Amino acid sequence: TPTTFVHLFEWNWQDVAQECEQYLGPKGYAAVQVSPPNEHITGSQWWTRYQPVSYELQSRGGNRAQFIDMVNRCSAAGVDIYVDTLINHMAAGSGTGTAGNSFGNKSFPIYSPQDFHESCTINNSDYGNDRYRVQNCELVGLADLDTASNYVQNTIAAYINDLQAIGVKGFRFDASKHVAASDIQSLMAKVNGSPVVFQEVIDQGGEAVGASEYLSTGLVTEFKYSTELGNTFRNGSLAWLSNFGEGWGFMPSSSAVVFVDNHDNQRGHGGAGNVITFEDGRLYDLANVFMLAYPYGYPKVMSSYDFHGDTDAGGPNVPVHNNGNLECFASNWKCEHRWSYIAGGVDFRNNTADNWAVTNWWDNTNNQISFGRGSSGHMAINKEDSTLTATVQTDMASGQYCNVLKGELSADAKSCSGEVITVNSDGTINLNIGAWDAMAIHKNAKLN
Numbered sequence: 001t002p003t004t005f006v007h008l009f010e011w012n013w014q015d016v017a018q019e020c021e022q023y024l025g026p027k028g029y030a031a032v033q034v035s036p037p038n039e040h041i042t043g044s045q046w047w048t049r050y051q052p053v054s055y056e057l058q059s060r061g062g063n064r065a066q067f068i069d070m071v072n073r074c075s076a077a078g079v080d081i082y083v084d085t086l087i088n089h090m091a092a093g094s095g096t097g098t099a100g101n102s103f104g105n106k107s108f109p110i111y112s113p114q115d116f117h118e119s120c121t122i123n124n125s126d127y128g129n130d131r132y133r134v135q136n137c138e139l140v141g142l143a144d145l146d147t148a149s150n151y152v153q154n155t156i157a158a159y160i161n162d163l164q165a166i167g168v169k170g171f172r173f174d175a176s177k178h179v180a181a182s183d184i185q186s187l188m189a190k191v192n193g194s195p196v197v198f199q200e201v202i203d204q205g206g207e208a209v210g211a212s213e214y215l216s217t218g219l220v221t222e223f224k225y226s227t228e229l230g231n232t233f234r235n236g237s238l239a240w241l242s243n244f245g246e247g248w249g250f251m252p253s254s255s256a257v258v259f260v261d262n263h264d265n266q267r268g269h270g271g272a273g274n275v276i277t278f279e280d281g282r283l284y285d286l287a288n289v290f291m292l293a294y295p296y297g298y299p300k301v302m303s304s305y306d307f308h309g310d311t312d313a314g315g316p317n318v319p320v321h322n323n324g325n326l327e328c329f330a331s332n333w334k335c336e337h338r339w340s341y342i343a344g345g346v347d348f349r350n351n352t353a354d355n356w357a358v359t360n361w362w363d364n365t366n367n368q369i370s371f372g373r374g375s376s377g378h379m380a381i382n383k384e385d386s387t388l389t390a391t392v393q394t395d396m397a398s399g400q401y402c403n404v405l406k407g408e409l410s411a412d413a414k415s416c417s418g419e420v421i422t423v424n425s426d427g428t429i430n431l432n433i434g435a436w437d438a439m440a441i442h443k444n445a446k447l448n
């Protein structure tokens with residue numbers, strides 16, 4: 001059963017379509033969050049995607065036909081498409097867009113200067129004491145749309161409904177904190193049906209505008225998750241994670257979208273150095289295994305490119321599927337969604353979705369933990385310097401199981417491609433996990 005989505009950051013439509021068919025579908029990912037498909041400013045930086053010019057489907061990712069082709073091919077493969085939608089602003093300054101349209105002085109093909117709030121700057125101190133400025137002033141110079149206007153609402157709603165008509169199943173509302181929750185409620189009343197909607201709201205406490213204000217209009221990004229998980233894995237004890245979630249003051253599990261890192265915080269926007277990313281290698285593997293095994297929120301796996309320390313740089317100059325070879329794992333696309341520990345975690349989550357309880361939690365008071373998901377699965381992480389050899393209790397049927405983080409069950413269920421884990425007649429497992437390693441087993445990866 002589908003439980004996890006992935007952000008194919010800066011991936012073009014051709015690459016996404018092929019990825020859906022060859023990997024995402026077969027591996028069980030539920031959906032793909034794509035980069036903004038609408039017309040945006042010209043330029044090679046990744047952030048040009050966040051400065052809209054119009055709603056025509058011609059962007060760095062491809063043209064309208066290629067976009068439609070991608071939705072169709074992914075849909076047939078069993079994978080949904082979530083579109084990153086810009087509901088708060090339009091591009092700053094003047095220029096030309098990716099579909100040839102010009103703009104300048106708050107004049108665009110679809111908006112006039114009167115469709116925006118009067119210009120003012122959002123200062124850092126405004127976040128803590130002035131909700132009016134946070135929602136009516138400009139985010140880093142971006143023209144702030146009058147989201148209370150019936151015209152503006154109809155225009156954004158037409159775009160969303162158009163995308164639904166061609167097959168899009170979900171939407172990410174970018175910069176939601178900068179738009180009054182009541183404006184979003186009014187916008188949603190114009191949207192057909194009930195697509196999956198998740199709102200980007202960064203709230204780590206002490207904001208004049210809180211994440212809780214957006215719970216009635218859809219799911220909300222829980223940034224406390226990314227930050228605390230990173231902080232605990234680097235500077236704390238994994239044993240503290242026994243009550244992770246609402247117990248730590250996070251929003252309701254059923255309303256949260258979580259992640260180890262996202263495209264912004266892996267670049268220092270909305271997250272400090274404690275955020276764990278692909279650069280951390282094995283540490284990133286372990287952080288993902290915890291997130292995917294733990295029953296809190298709707299997770300999304302990050303899929304990045306090596307930016308070589310340049311936080312403004314756009315993606316690689318080569319496609320992922322290049323003349324027969326995969327441009328993954330090296331200095332171009334990282335493809336974390338293909339890393340064995342991460343893909344194995346997704347498999348574990350997909351196969352334990354019938355039991356959302358954390359059962360039989362065990363820890364060594366520090367960096368060795370193990371817990372189950374009833375009789376559906378069990379896992380363990382060793383982040384100490386010595387082997388984890390403890391005997392832990394499970395609710396699983398005795399037998400042989402493939403450690404899904406390191407391999408998988410063959411078609412005839414006669415063998416695994418990686419190590420085998422044995423569940424004893426009394427439900428116990430005599431662990432044998434080396435330093436900075438883990439194991440995960442589930443009821444549907446049992447040897448015959």
Ligand SMILES: [Ca+2]
Nearest residue numbers: 135136144178
């Ligand atoms: Ca605004």
Ligand SMILES: [Cl-]
Nearest residue numbers: 172200221262
């Ligand atoms: Cl996000």
